[PDB]
Amino acid sequence: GSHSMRYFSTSVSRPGRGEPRFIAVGYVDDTQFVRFDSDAASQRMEPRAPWIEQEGPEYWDEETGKVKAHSQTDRENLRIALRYYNQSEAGSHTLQMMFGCDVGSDGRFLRGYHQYAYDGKDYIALKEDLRSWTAADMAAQITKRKWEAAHVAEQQRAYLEGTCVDGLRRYLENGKETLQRTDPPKTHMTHHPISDHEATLRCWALGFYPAEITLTWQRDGEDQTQDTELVETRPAGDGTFQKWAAVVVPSGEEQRYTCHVQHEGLPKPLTLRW
């Protein structure tokens, strides 16, 4: 019954090709709703969900101003990191940031987040108590001491427990039809002989929201993972998700394998059997 808001940003330096590129996106649960791209012509935060289009022009100007300031801050932080790691200015590097909050089905604050990675690896993160940091190496520890002395953690709590929560709640109401709906998985199963000894069974879940789901194979009632394969959950492009799980079985034995499907929109877990 809880929900989440997340913002994700990526800065990529381009030595000799100009200033670093900055791309930010915003999600409520698994539904995107804004974006900003420093190389786009508009230079604006742009809508990506229908329920956000109903925000007025002061919203888009303010949000544009905030994301642009972030792009400059991480411009700078890319330079400083190069210094801390004693790296040459000729190489390209990435700085990723994530921040947001969870609310309970209650409507009330559950969790806040604020985290960085450099070249794909943890740098510094705000711990759950919102009073302390976890740094990944000696370089991030310089930043860690700097941020403790300046009480950055305390100064982030207004946003994480106020603005963040307030906006997420408003979004959940302006978009109840989209964001508070559950789409149960439509399931089927497929069967392909691959020898006269063996066949593959593939268990499908289609058209479901939110993305969280579990597919498991049992043989004769016991969980089986040997000879199975499970793909990453993936977007259909219409706002729903897809996933499948497959198992190679001895020809003739298909009927002792069952696939089990758990999802929030399933009152009861589904069982599929060929």
Binding site: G26, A69, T73, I80, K146
Partner: peptide, 9 residues
């Protein structure tokens, strides 16, 4: 809503 973020490493 985004956060106003200006801190330096």
């Amino acid at each position: 809503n985004y956060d106003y973020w200006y801190r330096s490493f």
